[PDB]
Each structure stands twice: as C-alpha cells, then as structure tokens.
C-alpha cells in the first residue's frame, strides 16, 4: 500500500539517516537482530511504510545509501544496527568527491548512477503504490550535494507524480567546512529551486547554540544533532506513520505551505528542548508549548524570523490534549503579534494534532513554518559568491573538469532574481 | 564507450572553442594582449577561426574579430591581407 | 582503496622514509620481523594496515615505498640496520656515481642512466595496488640526488599519470644557516620543475626546527633524529584519516582540492602542534583554543616568515586525537574576530574539520610525550614570498660574474635556463604580490 | 589575458590534433565499429575532420574514413547525413 521510499546521500546524510533509522526502530520496538520486539498496537498495521514484509516477520529497512567513498559503509555498518540494512543498497565508488560538485557530478556521476537508478526502480516496482521519496543529505561536499540533486532530477523526470522533500544542510559563514562551499551552495540552489518540490533548512551552528544554551550539555557532538534531526523528522512523519484524529500528509502540507513554487523552503523546530535537571520540573501545558514554538530562541535557524513577516505556519502536535486551546492560542497570537505575519492572508496557522504520543516522551510537538528569515542567508551567499567570482578564485579546478563558467553566471542571475522576488514579497502591502 | 568518446572528443574541442569564444565576448575588448600574442603574424592563426564548426562558436568568434578589427587601420586591413574577408 | 606510494630520493629522503616507516610500525604494533609473533600477549594490530603495508598469504607485511639513491653509502648504512628483514633488497637501488649537490650530472649524465629500472619498479608497485590517490615524494633541494634525479623522475611520472595527485616534500636552504654553497644553484632549477609540473609543494627548513626545539624541548645538542621525528609526525597527522576513520574523514583529495587556489600558488604553510618534550607535557593543561591560537604564532612556524606582513587566502584545519567539536567551534569563533590575524577582504572563512578518534602514540627513546590530541595547520599566505625574493637576490648576486658555472657548462646544459628560471621566478613573485593586493 | 587565452586555445588545438588522429586511426578497424559510427551520429561531429586546416588530423582521419566508408553503404551514407560531403 502507501509506502515511502527513503534515499541517502553524503556522509553526514548517511549518519543522520542511520540515526533516524535507529530512533524509529527503538520507538517502534525492533531489536538489533531484525525481528520484532514491540508491545504497542499501531506498530504493526502501518509498520510497512518504512519496512517490507518478509518471511519470519523479519522486516527490512527501505533506504538506498549513495556514496563515493567506501569509508562510510564500514563506519555505519559496525554500529549496533548497521547489520540490519541491505548491503546491496550500499553503492559506493572507488574515488572520492574531494568536496567538488562539478567533478563529482561529471566523473563520479555517470558510470555509478545507473546502478542506483536500477535499484530504486526495482524498489519502486516491488511495491504497489507510492507517495514520495525522502532524501537526507548535506550541501557540504560533492557526495550529498553533487549526487542528490541528480537523483532528484532523475526521479522527477521518471515519476513526476511524487513528493520531493529533503533536509539539506545550509552553510554558515561563521561555521564553515569547505573553502569552495559558496560555489557548491550556489550550484545546488539552482537545482533545488528548479527541480525539487520542497526543501527544509538545516543548520549545525544554530543547533550547537541551542544545545549549549538550553540543553546545557557537557560535550555536545554530532550524535546529539543527529538525534535532534531524527526526532524532527519523526515528528514530521508521524502524521502518516501514526494516524490520530486530525491526520495530515506530506503533499497536503506541501500544497498548503507553499504559496509559490519558487519559494519552497521551510523552518523546522521541536518544542521540548530542556536541560537534564529540568526534566523533573516542568509544566506540561499548551501555552508553554506555544511560547516555545513561537519564540526564535527555540528555533533551529541561524537567523532571526523577527526581521520579516510570517508567511505560512503549520503546528503539528503529538499527544492527547484538546482542540480549543490551539485555535484560541493562534487567534490571540495573530491579534497581538499583528506586525509579524502577512496581514493580507488571515489564518496562516494550520492545526494538526496526533492522538498517538511518541515512545519515551508523553507530549511532543514540532514546528514547520516558512518565515521571512532566510533572505539574509540568501543575500550573504550571493555577496560571497560575487566576491569569489570577481577575481575567479578556486576556479581552475572546475574549469579542468570540462564545464564552463557561464553556469556560475546563470546561477547568480537566478540567485539575484530569487532574492529580488523574496524582498519584494516581504513587504506584501495591502494596496497602493 | 569508445564511440561515445568519439562523439565526446569531437564535441570537446567544439565546446573548447565555444568557451574561448563566449569568453572573447569580453576578451576582445582588450587590445594590448591581442597585439602581444599577434606580433608573430598570428592573423594566420586567426585564419582558421572561421573554420569554426557550429553556431555556438562562430556566433561570438565574429564578436571577437570585430573588436580585433577596431584597433587600427592595419587590423581592419588584416582581414584583407590575411585573406579572411 | 586508500593506498599511496612513497618516493624517497637522496639521503634525507631515505632517512625520512625510514623514520616514517618505523613510526608506522611502532604505532600499528608491526614487528620488525614482518610477522605477528605476539602469540602470548597481544598489543594491537587489528586495524586497516592495507593503506601502507600489504598482507601476504603467510601473514607477511611488505612496505610500499621507493628507496633510490645515487650514492651506495646510504643504502649500505640502511642495509646493516636492524630493519633489513622488513623491506626487500630490490627496493633499494644503489649507484656507481652520485650527484652530491649537483644538478648537471644528476640530471643528464647520472640520472638518465637509471630510468628503466625505477620505472619498472614503480609500475610493478602500482600494479600491486588497487586504489591510488597520490604519491609521497621525499627529496631535497640542496642534495643533488634529490634535485636532478627527482626532477627527471617526476617529469615522467606527471606525463605517465595525470589523474593522480603529485605531492612534494623537501628542505629549504635557510637564509641564515646552510650546509653547502651551491644550494641556490640547484634550488633555482628545481623550483621551476616543481612549479610548472606539479600540483602541490610543501616547503620546510631546519633553523625553525632548531629554534622550536631549543625553545620548547630545551636541548643544547640537537640531532637529525628528532628532526626526522617531527617530519614523520607531521606526515602521519596529514595522512591520519586514511589509515583510520573518524567523525569527518578528510582524504588526500578532500584537502588537496581546496589547498590549491591557483595553479601557480600551491605552497602551504605547515605548522605542527604541540611540539613539546616530556616535562613540557605534564603540568600543562592542553585545550583546543590555546593550541589553535599558538599555531598562528610565527615562532611555531616551520618557515621563518612573519604572517603579519601578508594575509591569508585559504586555510586547511586538521585534528588528531580526542577533540570535542564545541572547542573547535569556540576556537573558530575566537580566531575569526582576531584583529592580529590578517586575511583577504573577499574570503570570510575557510578551513576543514578532520576528527580523528585515534590519539597520537609515543615512541620509546624519542622526545615526544603522551599528548591526548594533536593539531596541524596548512594555510596559504603571501607573507612567505620573501623567501623566494631572497633566493632570487642570492642567485642574481651569484650569477653576475658566473661563480661555479663553468662546471655546469662543461657538464652540458644550456645557460639560458638560468635566465629562464630567473624570469619565471620573477613572474611567479609578481603573481604572488598581485594576489596579495586586495581591492 | 589574451596571451594566456591563445596559449590555452593552442594546447587544446594540439590535444584535439592528437586525439582526433589516434581515434580515427583506432576506430576504423572493425566492422561493428563501422556500423556504430554509422549509428552513433559521429559524422556531424566528424565534419571538422574534412573541414579544419590541420594536416595530420585530416590525413589520418580521412584515410581511416576511406577504411570506414569501405565496409558498407551505411557509413558512407551517414557521412552524407553528417553533412560532410
């Protein structure tokens, strides 16, 4: 029946996908061996969305790991749950990307792409009917950013009637990992705005700040960030994984959340981010959740939503509370904070409550919104790209691959068009 | 792959000149390096620049030859003496 | 997979390769015999040793390196050592006549005689390997063997393999102290070859090593052993994510792609830390921010140059040992706002994150202590262009009246190359200052 | 800037020369290669091989083509399709 095919790209993408798989297996009651060890009710009926029915009830994961370096498969396989996946899906090459989008797309994206197309088409035909494809990757490298966009384009071309959601990682001038990162970001944004349904923004610096100032962790590492993003996606996908009273799905939000195809980015966020000594002193209620989903402090963005106006808001809840409190809260928020949302569109907040609470936590609620706060990231990326492209630094590497420089020109032209559009829609006046 | 590389190398020299040309869309504005390269009768080396395969190259190779010809009387007469007219 | 071939030319290259191999064997628990005789008490060795060593059917480890030298005395000195049971005699090619700080003979009348042998050796070694990424060429500019022979071999390796990375590691003739006199004569010729025919070149000297050892390790009578130990530790830190794994693996290509901003500017500034002795590592709290800040200190640089004279364009950041990402983020936030450190007005940020879970090890009999984490820095700045300026000045003031040039004329070479090398160096310097000039 | 431009132009001219010669000589040896060069659409891209000014390129190329068009009506007719005649 209705299933979702999951895709993997990039070492960071691989690790976050593995963390998500471990989280969902633990929540749904799956032993590391491969059998079932759950004790719930809804964990058997719709469990096939991410798994596959097999003999002996041994459900198998549904995710294809795409990488250019063999060193990631061994790392992700040696873990407590790396022996449950499909080794056939671990399609790795012999040469690394070298943090090059052009070289990876050209050289390591021709002779290796056929195998992943074959395996994904086999998986697609293995099921009856599908909805969309989930790909988790990062733009920091030639593996995730160089390959995911290509696989995204191919799957759109073959099956246009599918949902295209991703959780790519946005860069940050403060926290960098690649010298040519602005070039890769500029190249990837073109494909993201041309050949992708929807995209979610992921930043590591904001998560680091959030954990440091709220979670108050001793030695925060990438494991904590992977846990956070896995919980984020779990709260995102519980609308279909665990039906409640008011259920939703990915295309319904994708239609109701996106006013125009060119602006498909979002701003995810989870509500209960507390310290270890604060877990036993907290008041589980609605207004607290509303305040933590509305404030910019809890938000995982490396920017400020208060600089613009809110466009669309979706509040997805997961618990057993009520319905009246949500509508009254959003009503009084829109009445009070009138200068923070678009006045031309009333009722920009969407209600969604999942009657099934998560495993390990009783109340949970995520925030999916598209606020006017990415414009600063866009403009700073455009500025740094223009500065890099003025004297044409770090360009001979891409030139030697074969592709020309006009691609950067058209990419920055589209960049300027997109940002102009964004800022002339930020001030969405009522009339003249 | 050998036949694909046949097509590929042909198109690769094709697009190499294409890119030289889409650059000389703005390179031709600069005469000092044009003369620096040109001194050794390199108008003969610009003779095969009309032997330039597809529209994607010729299209701005003409824009090159233009600003090449603006620099003096002699470069405009070079299309005559180089038998490029 | 991630496998590379090391090249050792000259006495310095041979001894550096020996130090690197012994460091690798001690750090991986590899016994000098070549077997695993530890059948009573194990002490490690269950890792990915395929990067450098090879596994046979009987459990033997064969080194993958090239030990070539025009003089047989170094080969004999190594052969009588305690590790003669590890490598193979076919890998150490001797020679009748040597260069001994001469480019002419070692490039025309000496190095051209043994070409097929080493070419067959390297071809066999490459065929024995599956995945090849780059090479580890160890030579010297002062040594004639490491200058003429190295140049002629790399010129053929470049035309025989274009898709493979070509690294370079040698020693710089210090402006203050020096070993020989004709060092600039070989250097001015080797620089052109390493610039117009290679991708990356690492340049280090000895006076900085002496200064840092007398300042931190506090030794009054230094020796070449510690000099080789420092270089071996640097090399191991550079190629750390290849033999092992970590949070963010950084391969040779991953850093080499960004470390080269332009085809002409490929001379990074290496800086290892902490370079301390045993007592200098006991009552000293070591964190990441302090060592990162110390890495930019000119006193800790292996090249005698003031970074404040110029500014940085591209930076490559590495780590090895138990390092926490929060410390790295704090250090990056600290250095990005430091007014002392100068950088170009276009590049706001650039660096890498190599997290290596394996901490660096120690050697019995060495001077390095047990440090929980290490750090190495590969930055690119124009302030190092002064060394080329001084070298050009010295070559010009030695070339006015043609001192010690009749020997090269008699050996057989064209004198215009001195002018060619001089003008090429002038053009390269001009490009360096043009890049260093902002808007 | 135009000097380095013309340099790059001419080293790519020379690599085009070498590659064109080597590949025309190689791919004209087997009948399946004849039929594939018929069907691969080479000849619109091989049109420069009877077009450009280079002596060695064209000599090796057209000699191999005489080998190539000898096997069948197919390759020689596709030469017409490539608008080379």
Coordinates of C-alpha atoms in Angstrom, one line a residue, chain A:
Chain A
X1 CA 0.0 0.0 0.0
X2 CA 1.0 3.6 0.6
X3 CA 4.7 3.5 1.3
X4 CA 7.6 6.0 1.3
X5 CA 11.0 5.2 -0.3
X6 CA 14.0 6.7 1.6
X7 CA 17.2 7.8 0.0
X8 CA 20.7 8.6 1.3
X9 CA 23.5 10.8 0.2
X10 CA 26.6 12.3 1.8
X11 CA 28.5 11.1 4.9
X12 CA 26.6 13.5 7.1
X13 CA 23.4 12.4 5.3
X14 CA 24.4 8.7 5.8
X15 CA 25.0 9.3 9.6
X16 CA 21.8 11.2 10.1
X17 CA 19.8 8.6 8.2
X18 CA 21.3 5.8 10.3
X19 CA 20.4 7.8 13.4
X20 CA 16.9 8.2 12.2
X21 CA 16.6 4.5 11.4
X22 CA 17.9 3.6 14.9
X23 CA 15.4 6.1 16.5
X24 CA 12.4 4.7 14.6
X25 CA 13.5 1.1 15.3
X26 CA 13.8 1.9 19.0
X27 CA 10.5 3.7 19.1
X28 CA 8.6 1.0 17.2
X29 CA 10.2 -1.8 19.1
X30 CA 12.7 -3.5 16.8
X31 CA 15.6 -5.5 18.2
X32 CA 19.0 -5.0 16.6
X33 CA 18.7 -8.6 15.2
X34 CA 15.9 -7.9 12.8
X35 CA 12.8 -9.4 14.4
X36 CA 10.0 -7.5 16.2
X37 CA 10.1 -6.8 20.0
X38 CA 7.4 -4.2 20.3
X39 CA 4.4 -4.2 22.5
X40 CA 2.2 -1.5 21.1
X41 CA -0.9 -1.5 18.8
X42 CA -0.3 0.8 15.8
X43 CA 3.2 -0.6 15.4
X44 CA 2.1 -3.5 13.3
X45 CA -0.6 -2.2 10.9
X46 CA 1.2 0.8 9.2
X47 CA 4.7 -0.5 10.0
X48 CA 5.1 -1.5 6.3
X49 CA 5.6 2.2 5.3
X50 CA 9.3 2.1 6.0
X51 CA 9.8 -1.7 6.2
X52 CA 8.9 -4.6 4.0
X53 CA 7.0 -7.8 4.7
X54 CA 9.3 -10.9 4.7
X55 CA 9.3 -14.4 6.0
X56 CA 9.6 -14.9 9.7
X57 CA 8.3 -11.4 10.2
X58 CA 11.8 -10.0 9.8
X59 CA 11.1 -6.5 8.4
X60 CA 13.9 -5.0 6.3
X61 CA 14.7 -1.3 6.0
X62 CA 13.9 0.6 2.8
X63 CA 16.8 3.0 2.2
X64 CA 19.5 3.3 -0.5
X65 CA 22.9 4.5 0.6
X66 CA 24.6 6.5 -2.1
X67 CA 28.3 7.5 -1.5
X68 CA 31.5 8.0 -3.4
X69 CA 33.9 6.9 -0.7
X70 CA 34.0 3.3 0.7
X71 CA 35.0 4.5 4.1
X72 CA 31.5 5.4 5.2
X73 CA 29.9 2.0 4.7
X74 CA 32.3 0.3 7.2
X75 CA 31.7 3.1 9.8
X76 CA 27.9 2.9 9.5
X77 CA 27.9 -0.9 9.3
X78 CA 29.9 -1.5 12.5
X79 CA 27.3 0.1 14.7
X80 CA 24.7 -1.6 16.8
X81 CA 22.2 -1.5 14.0
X82 CA 24.4 -1.5 10.8
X83 CA 23.9 -5.2 10.2
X84 CA 20.2 -4.9 9.6
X85 CA 20.2 -2.9 6.3
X86 CA 20.6 -4.1 2.7
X87 CA 24.3 -4.4 1.7
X88 CA 23.1 -4.2 -2.0
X89 CA 21.9 -0.6 -1.4
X90 CA 25.4 0.5 -0.3
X91 CA 26.5 1.6 -3.7
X92 CA 30.0 3.2 -3.3
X93 CA 32.6 4.2 -5.8
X94 CA 36.4 4.0 -5.7
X95 CA 37.4 7.7 -5.9
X96 CA 36.3 10.4 -3.5
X97 CA 34.5 13.6 -4.4
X98 CA 37.1 15.9 -2.9
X99 CA 34.4 18.4 -1.9
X100 CA 33.9 19.1 -5.6
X101 CA 30.3 19.4 -7.0
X102 CA 31.4 19.6 -10.7
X103 CA 33.9 16.8 -10.6
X104 CA 31.5 14.5 -8.7
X105 CA 28.6 15.3 -10.9
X106 CA 30.6 14.8 -14.1
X107 CA 33.1 12.0 -13.3
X108 CA 31.5 10.1 -10.4
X109 CA 28.0 10.7 -11.6
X110 CA 28.0 8.9 -15.0
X111 CA 29.2 5.3 -14.5
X112 CA 27.8 4.9 -11.0
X113 CA 24.4 6.5 -11.5
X114 CA 23.0 3.5 -13.5
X115 CA 23.2 1.1 -10.5
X116 CA 21.3 3.4 -8.2
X117 CA 18.7 4.0 -10.8
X118 CA 18.3 0.3 -11.2
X119 CA 18.0 -0.4 -7.5
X120 CA 15.5 2.4 -7.0
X121 CA 13.4 1.3 -9.9
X122 CA 13.4 -2.2 -8.5
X123 CA 12.3 -0.9 -5.1
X124 CA 9.6 1.2 -6.8
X125 CA 8.2 -1.8 -8.7
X126 CA 8.4 -4.0 -5.7
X127 CA 5.6 -2.1 -4.0
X128 CA 2.0 -1.4 -5.2
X129 CA 1.7 2.4 -4.9
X130 CA 4.0 5.1 -3.5
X131 CA 3.6 8.8 -2.5
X132 CA 7.1 10.3 -2.4
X133 CA 10.8 9.9 -1.9
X134 CA 12.8 11.2 1.1
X135 CA 16.4 12.1 0.7
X136 CA 18.6 13.3 3.6
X137 CA 21.9 14.9 2.5
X138 CA 24.2 17.9 3.1
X139 CA 25.4 20.6 0.8
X140 CA 28.9 20.4 2.4
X141 CA 30.6 18.2 -0.1
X142 CA 30.5 16.7 -3.5
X143 CA 28.8 13.5 -2.3
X144 CA 25.5 14.7 -1.0
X145 CA 25.1 17.9 -3.0
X146 CA 26.7 16.5 -6.2
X147 CA 24.6 13.3 -6.3
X148 CA 21.3 14.0 -4.5
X149 CA 20.3 16.8 -6.9
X150 CA 21.0 14.5 -9.9
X151 CA 19.0 11.6 -8.4
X152 CA 16.3 14.1 -7.5
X153 CA 16.2 15.3 -11.1
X154 CA 16.1 11.7 -12.5
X155 CA 13.2 10.7 -10.2
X156 CA 11.2 13.8 -11.1
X157 CA 11.8 13.0 -14.8
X158 CA 10.7 9.4 -14.5
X159 CA 7.9 9.8 -11.9
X160 CA 6.7 13.4 -11.9
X161 CA 3.8 12.5 -9.7
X162 CA 5.8 12.1 -6.5
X163 CA 6.6 14.2 -3.4
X164 CA 10.2 15.6 -3.3
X165 CA 11.1 16.5 0.3
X166 CA 14.7 16.8 1.6
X167 CA 16.5 18.1 4.7
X168 CA 19.7 19.5 3.1
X169 CA 22.1 21.4 5.4
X170 CA 22.5 25.1 4.8
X171 CA 26.0 26.6 5.2
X172 CA 27.0 29.4 7.6
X173 CA 29.9 31.9 7.2
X174 CA 30.6 31.5 11.0
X175 CA 30.9 27.7 10.9
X176 CA 32.5 26.5 7.7
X177 CA 33.9 23.2 6.5
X178 CA 34.7 23.8 2.8
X179 CA 36.7 26.6 1.2
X180 CA 34.6 26.3 -2.0
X181 CA 31.4 25.9 -0.1
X182 CA 29.8 29.0 -1.5
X183 CA 30.3 27.6 -5.0
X184 CA 28.7 24.3 -4.2
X185 CA 25.8 26.1 -2.4
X186 CA 25.2 28.3 -5.5
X187 CA 25.3 25.3 -7.8
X188 CA 22.9 23.3 -5.6
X189 CA 20.4 26.1 -5.1
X190 CA 19.7 26.2 -8.8
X191 CA 18.6 22.6 -8.9
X192 CA 16.8 22.9 -5.6
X193 CA 14.6 25.8 -6.9
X194 CA 14.3 24.3 -10.4
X195 CA 13.7 20.5 -9.9
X196 CA 12.5 20.0 -6.3
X197 CA 9.1 20.0 -4.6
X198 CA 10.1 21.2 -1.2
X199 CA 13.2 21.7 0.9
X200 CA 13.9 22.1 4.7
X201 CA 16.8 24.2 6.0
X202 CA 19.3 22.5 8.4
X203 CA 22.0 24.4 10.2
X204 CA 24.5 23.0 12.7
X205 CA 25.6 26.2 14.3
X206 CA 22.1 27.0 15.5
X207 CA 21.7 23.5 16.9
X208 CA 25.0 23.9 18.7
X209 CA 23.9 27.2 20.2
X210 CA 20.5 25.7 21.2
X211 CA 22.0 22.7 23.0
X212 CA 24.7 24.8 24.7
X213 CA 22.3 27.5 26.0
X214 CA 19.3 25.3 26.8
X215 CA 20.2 21.6 26.9
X216 CA 23.5 22.6 28.7
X217 CA 25.4 19.6 27.5
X218 CA 28.9 18.9 28.7
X219 CA 30.4 17.6 25.4
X220 CA 27.9 18.1 22.6
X221 CA 28.8 16.2 19.4
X222 CA 27.3 15.3 16.0
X223 CA 25.4 12.5 17.7
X224 CA 23.2 15.0 19.6
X225 CA 22.5 16.9 16.4
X226 CA 21.6 13.6 14.6
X227 CA 19.3 12.7 17.5
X228 CA 17.6 16.1 17.2
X229 CA 17.1 15.9 13.4
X230 CA 15.9 12.4 13.7
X231 CA 13.3 13.4 16.3
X232 CA 12.4 16.3 14.0
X233 CA 11.7 14.0 11.0
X234 CA 9.9 11.6 13.3
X235 CA 7.5 14.3 14.4
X236 CA 7.2 15.3 10.7
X237 CA 6.3 11.8 9.6
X238 CA 4.1 10.7 12.5
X239 CA 1.2 12.4 10.6
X240 CA 1.2 9.3 8.3
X241 CA 3.1 6.8 10.5
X242 CA 0.7 7.0 13.4
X243 CA -2.8 8.2 12.5
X244 CA -4.7 10.2 15.1
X245 CA -7.8 12.4 15.0
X246 CA -6.6 15.1 12.6
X247 CA -4.1 13.3 10.3
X248 CA -2.1 15.0 7.6
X249 CA 0.3 14.0 4.9
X250 CA 3.4 15.4 3.1
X251 CA 1.7 16.6 -0.1
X252 CA -1.2 18.3 1.8
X253 CA 1.4 20.4 3.7
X254 CA 3.5 20.8 0.5
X255 CA 0.4 22.4 -1.2
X256 CA -0.9 24.4 1.8
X257 CA 2.5 25.5 3.0
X258 CA 4.0 26.8 -0.3
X259 CA 2.4 29.9 -1.9
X260 CA 4.7 29.8 -5.0
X261 CA 6.8 27.1 -6.5
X262 CA 10.0 29.2 -6.4
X263 CA 9.7 29.6 -2.6
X264 CA 9.6 26.1 -1.1
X265 CA 11.9 26.4 1.9
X266 CA 10.8 25.9 5.5
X267 CA 12.0 26.3 9.1
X268 CA 11.6 23.2 11.3
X269 CA 11.6 23.1 15.0
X270 CA 10.9 21.0 18.1
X271 CA 9.2 22.3 21.3
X272 CA 10.5 20.5 24.4
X273 CA 14.3 21.3 24.5
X274 CA 15.1 21.3 28.2
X275 CA 18.2 20.5 30.3
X276 CA 18.7 17.3 32.3
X277 CA 18.0 18.9 35.6
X278 CA 14.8 20.5 34.3
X279 CA 13.1 17.3 33.1
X280 CA 11.6 16.7 36.6
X281 CA 10.4 20.3 37.0
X282 CA 8.2 21.3 34.1
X283 CA 4.5 22.1 33.5
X284 CA 3.0 20.1 30.6
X285 CA 0.5 22.5 29.0
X286 CA -0.5 24.3 25.9
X287 CA 0.7 28.0 26.4
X288 CA 4.2 26.8 27.2
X289 CA 4.4 24.7 24.0
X290 CA 3.0 27.7 22.1
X291 CA 5.7 30.1 23.5
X292 CA 8.5 27.6 22.7
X293 CA 7.1 27.1 19.1
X294 CA 6.7 30.8 18.6
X295 CA 9.9 32.3 20.0
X296 CA 13.1 32.5 17.9
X297 CA 15.2 31.2 20.8
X298 CA 14.0 27.6 20.4
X299 CA 14.1 27.7 16.6
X300 CA 17.0 25.9 15.0
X301 CA 17.6 28.8 12.5
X302 CA 20.9 30.7 12.3
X303 CA 18.9 33.9 11.6
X304 CA 16.0 36.0 13.0
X305 CA 12.4 35.5 11.9
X306 CA 11.5 38.8 13.5
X307 CA 13.2 40.7 10.7
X308 CA 10.4 39.9 8.3
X309 CA 6.8 38.7 8.3
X310 CA 5.4 35.2 8.7
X311 CA 4.1 33.7 5.5
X312 CA 2.7 30.3 6.4
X313 CA 2.6 28.3 9.7
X314 CA 1.9 24.7 10.5
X315 CA 1.8 23.4 14.0
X316 CA 1.9 19.6 14.3
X317 CA 1.1 18.2 17.7
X318 CA 1.6 14.7 19.1
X319 CA -0.3 13.9 22.2
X320 CA -3.7 13.9 23.9
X321 CA -4.7 17.4 24.9
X322 CA -7.7 19.1 23.2
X323 CA -8.6 21.2 20.1
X324 CA -9.9 24.5 21.6
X325 CA -6.6 25.6 23.1
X326 CA -4.7 25.6 19.8
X327 CA -7.2 27.7 18.0
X328 CA -7.5 30.2 20.9
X329 CA -3.7 30.4 21.1
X330 CA -3.2 31.1 17.4
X331 CA -6.1 33.6 17.5
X332 CA -4.7 35.7 20.3
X333 CA -1.2 35.4 18.8
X334 CA -2.5 36.8 15.5
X335 CA -4.4 39.5 17.3
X336 CA -1.4 40.6 19.5
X337 CA 1.6 39.9 17.2
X338 CA -0.1 41.5 14.2
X339 CA 3.1 43.0 12.7
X340 CA 4.8 39.6 12.5
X341 CA 2.6 37.9 9.9
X342 CA 1.2 38.8 6.5
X343 CA -2.0 40.8 7.1
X344 CA -3.4 40.1 3.6
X345 CA -3.7 36.4 4.4
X346 CA -5.6 35.7 7.6
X347 CA -5.4 32.3 9.4
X348 CA -1.8 31.5 8.4
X349 CA -1.5 28.8 11.2
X350 CA -2.6 25.2 10.5
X351 CA -3.8 22.9 13.2
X352 CA -2.6 19.3 13.4
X353 CA -2.7 17.0 16.5
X354 CA -1.6 13.4 16.5
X355 CA -3.5 11.4 19.1
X356 CA -0.7 8.9 19.3
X357 CA 2.1 10.1 21.7
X358 CA 5.7 9.2 20.9
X359 CA 7.6 6.5 22.7
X360 CA 9.7 7.7 25.6
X361 CA 8.1 11.1 25.7
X362 CA 4.5 11.9 26.6
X363 CA 3.9 15.4 25.0
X364 CA 5.7 16.3 21.8
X365 CA 5.1 19.0 19.1
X366 CA 7.1 20.1 16.1
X367 CA 7.1 23.5 14.2
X368 CA 7.0 23.6 10.4
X369 CA 6.9 27.2 9.2
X370 CA 8.1 29.4 6.4
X371 CA 9.0 32.7 8.0
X372 CA 10.8 35.7 6.4
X373 CA 14.3 34.9 7.8
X374 CA 16.2 33.1 5.0
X375 CA 16.6 36.2 3.0
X376 CA 19.7 37.2 5.0
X377 CA 21.3 33.8 4.3
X378 CA 20.4 34.2 0.6
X379 CA 21.8 37.7 0.3
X380 CA 25.0 36.8 2.2
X381 CA 25.5 33.8 0.0
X382 CA 25.0 35.9 -3.1
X383 CA 27.5 38.5 -1.8
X384 CA 30.2 35.9 -1.0
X385 CA 29.7 34.3 -4.4
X386 CA 30.1 37.6 -6.2
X387 CA 33.2 38.3 -4.2
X388 CA 34.6 34.9 -5.1
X389 CA 33.7 35.2 -8.8
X390 CA 35.0 38.7 -9.2
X391 CA 38.7 37.6 -9.4
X392 CA 37.7 34.0 -10.2
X393 CA 39.4 32.2 -7.3
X394 CA 39.4 28.4 -6.9
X395 CA 38.0 28.2 -10.4
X396 CA 40.7 26.3 -12.4
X397 CA 39.6 23.1 -10.6
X398 CA 36.1 23.3 -12.0
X399 CA 37.5 24.6 -15.4
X400 CA 39.7 21.5 -15.8
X401 CA 36.7 19.2 -15.4
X402 CA 35.2 20.5 -18.6
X403 CA 32.2 22.6 -17.7
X404 CA 32.3 26.3 -18.5
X405 CA 31.9 29.4 -16.3
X406 CA 28.5 30.5 -17.8
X407 CA 26.9 28.2 -15.4
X408 CA 28.0 30.4 -12.5
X409 CA 26.7 33.4 -14.4
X410 CA 23.2 32.0 -14.8
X411 CA 23.2 30.6 -11.3
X412 CA 24.0 34.1 -9.8
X413 CA 21.4 35.7 -12.2
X414 CA 18.8 33.3 -10.9
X415 CA 20.0 34.0 -7.4
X416 CA 19.5 37.7 -7.8
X417 CA 16.1 37.2 -9.3
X418 CA 15.1 34.9 -6.5
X419 CA 16.3 37.4 -3.8
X420 CA 14.6 40.3 -5.5
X421 CA 11.4 38.4 -5.6
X422 CA 11.8 37.5 -1.9
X423 CA 12.3 41.0 -0.7
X424 CA 9.6 42.5 -2.9
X425 CA 7.2 39.9 -1.4
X426 CA 8.5 40.5 2.2
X427 CA 6.7 43.9 2.1
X428 CA 3.4 42.5 0.9
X429 CA 1.3 45.6 1.2
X430 CA -2.5 45.6 1.0
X431 CA -2.8 48.2 -1.7
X432 CA -1.1 51.3 -3.1

